[PDB]
Point group: C2
Chain length 212, copies 2
């Protein structure tokens, strides 16, 4: 959990954020790791397809690397909000505490935070909290979201347009399940609504989007 | 932070707690680590003086090992309280989330929690939260607590009885500093009170106890 790649990606994100060119020496300095250690960490982050060292020797985050960096910063900043507004930790300690929490905070906890905190637009240090959008502030496909224990979620998309199988359209219509419909899900993928039970086919089990 | 020793000590604490004999196989099972891995982890926890394998091959925690185990469980359980009462995380996820947070939660955060939570006597799973006493629910000696930036703390003990140096007794008396006196501290160790400033001698800087 508490990992290096997450820490490096956040650092790149920050420098980028402060308008600084993400150069390896700048990163080594901030993270207080030797230049040889960063060179080798960057060397393997490059193999995971998270970063690429541009011609000018600056670190360009790949789309995947950037998405990960964004989740880390969102978690870090939501941690800061929780620590100051709710917990009341001394403002002088908040940042260093949030730097450890960012690696162990789950998506599920972030969603709850986003709901219990008064304001999640900025961290107490003035910077905006990124990626709130990924937190329903499209959606999880049921095959991934659906657990062995029912959980009422909301249908975001059906994607009938991508269905080669249309046999269950009326089944959903009779079931009264559409975009915005609070439904019960169990993982074949059975999704209940209005007392009518619908066992989704694989194609539908893969393209229907929901939000917790 | 997120470490093995902490995890093992907590496991021993739990088994002990549930009345189970802390045997290595029981621990390997619960932690889902092979028997050889636990043998070697226990083998080095024994060298750190945290655990001793009793004659019957059961693990007896040393006083130091037990104190550490207690802090880990207190943190873990205060995390559970925070996650259910404040955050509202699903009761089915609370334990596994708290198991990661226990390694990154600072003492300073625990004290704040103890203040912001309605009840810290038990975790939502029915077990008591241990070591609250270590959280002021005696004290930190100023030499360790005193930081470069003043912070009004409360004097818990003076320990005049252990002072070979008595030159500053009247200095404190004139300073009106005693057990219960809210004082300002800066780290020689200067502790202000009622506008009068007292630069403690080493012996006093080491034995005076305070609580944040």
């Amino acid at each position: 959990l508490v990992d290096t790649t997450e820490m490096y990606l956040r650092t790149i994100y920050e420098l980028e954020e402060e308008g600084v060119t993400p150069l390896r020496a700048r990163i080594a300095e901030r993270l207080e790791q030797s230049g040889p250690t960063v060179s080798q960490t960057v060397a393997r982050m490059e193999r995971d397809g998270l970063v690429v060292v541009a011609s000018d020797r600056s670190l360009q985050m790949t789309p995947t690397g950037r998405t990960l960096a964004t989740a880390v910063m969102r978690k870090h900043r939501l941690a800061e909000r929780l620590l100051t507004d709710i917990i009341g930790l001394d403002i002088n300690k908040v940042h260093d505490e949030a730097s450890r929490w960012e690696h162990v905070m789950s998506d599920e906890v972030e969603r709850r935070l986003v709901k219990v905190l008064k304001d999640v637009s900025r961290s107490p240090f003035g910077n905006p909290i990124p990626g709130l959008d990924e937190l329903g502030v499209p959606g999880t496909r049921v095959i991934d979201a659906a657990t062995s224990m029912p959980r009422k979620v909301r249908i975001v998309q059906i994607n009938e347009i991508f269905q080669v199988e249309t046999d269950q359209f009326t089944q959903l219509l009779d079931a009264d399940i559409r975009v915005g419909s609070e439904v019960e899900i169990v993982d074949h993928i059975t999704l209940s609504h209005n007392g009518k039970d619908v066992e989704l086919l694989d194609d539908l089990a893969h393209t229907i989007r929901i939000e917790e």
